[PDB]
């Protein structure tokens, strides 16, 4: 087996209690209290409307990715990836465009900075639906499950839309809910080859998952990259102090393109 197979059966393993302590144990969180409230309050304006803004900033802000011109949003939601893109310098357009209707993440609607560049649809299922050209590329899409070979697929579904959507100089942040399965590790290597880019763990996810995410501004070798976040997360069953290191909230600034109170 790989590593990664290995870490998930012991994951799968753990008690109900001990799994809680093992999901958030030396990973960083959001602090979200006072952004939800506002939300739960009917406030549209500084406030992100998941904790995935945050995670997307985390990219941003390390020109992993460089969201620019129209960005399209695959499997968006409630939207934290789009209006995120929304408030940035050199963004132009955003699509998001998402399934959401019941058991699922309607789009909210939000007067945050740049909301005006941002269209959302719900209603839609990515999968089957023809490629728009485009310059970023964004996908979050991946439902986890505890088995790895159902999750492979799911990655692989993923990596093979995303697939569909990228020209030649388009700029990507992909979630790969899955990478340690070989057949994913392998689709990996071939879409690496071809569109660049690397696999990159994001400080934000939780230990229960092994999620990382091909970005386009990063290189290395796809194993090495997944072989070290299957040391990370198996040395973390064992570990010491705690408790999550928080972070705060995204403040998205308010209003229309320039005139405006910016993020
Ligand atoms: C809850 N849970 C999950 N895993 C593992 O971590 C991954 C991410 O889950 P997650 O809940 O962190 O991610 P979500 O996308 O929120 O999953 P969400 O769909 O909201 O709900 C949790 C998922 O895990 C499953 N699950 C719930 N309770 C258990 C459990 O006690 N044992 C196992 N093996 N699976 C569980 C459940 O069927 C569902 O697919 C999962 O795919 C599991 O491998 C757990 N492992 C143990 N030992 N005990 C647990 O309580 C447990």
């Known amino acids: 087996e790989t590593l990664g197979e290995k870490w998930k059966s012991r994951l799968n393993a753990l008690g109900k ?3 809680q302590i093992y999901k958030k144990s030396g990973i960083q969180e959001v602090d979200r209290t006072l952004a939800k409230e506002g939300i739960k309050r009917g406030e549209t304006d500084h406030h992100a409307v998941s904790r995935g803004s945050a995670k997307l900033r985390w990219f941003v802000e390390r020109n992993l ?15 934290g990836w789009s209006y995120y893109c929304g408030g ?26 740049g909301w005006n560049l941002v269209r959302l649809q719900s209603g839609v299922d990515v999968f089957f639906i023809p490629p728009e050209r485009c310059d970023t590329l964004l996908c979050d899409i991946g439902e986890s499950s505890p088995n790895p070979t159902v999750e492979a697929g799911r990655t692989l ?3 093979n839309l995303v697939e569909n959507w990228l020209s030649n100089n388009t ?19 071939a879409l690496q080859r071809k569109h660049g880019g690397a696999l990159v763990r994001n400080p934000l996810s939780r230990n229960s998952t092994h999620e990382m995410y091909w970005v386009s501004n990063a290189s290395g070798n796809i194993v090495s990259s997944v072989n070290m976040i299957s040391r990370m997360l198996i040395n973390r069953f064992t570990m010491r102090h705690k408790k999550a290191t928080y972070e705060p909230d995204v403040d998205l600034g308010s209003g229309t393109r320039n005139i405006g109170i910016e993020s």
């Open 88 to 113: 940035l310098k050199n963004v132009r357009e955003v699509k998001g465009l998402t399934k959401g209707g019941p058991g699922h993440e309607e789009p909210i609607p939000m007067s945050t900075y």
């Open 171 to 189: 700029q990507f942040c992909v979630k790969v809910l899955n990478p340690y399965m070989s057949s994913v590790i392998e689709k990996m290597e």
């Open 17 to 19: 209690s001990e799994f």
């Open 65 to 79: 990715v460089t969201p620019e011109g129209k960005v399209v949003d695959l499997g968006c939601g409630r939207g």
């Open 157 to 159: 579904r993923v990596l």
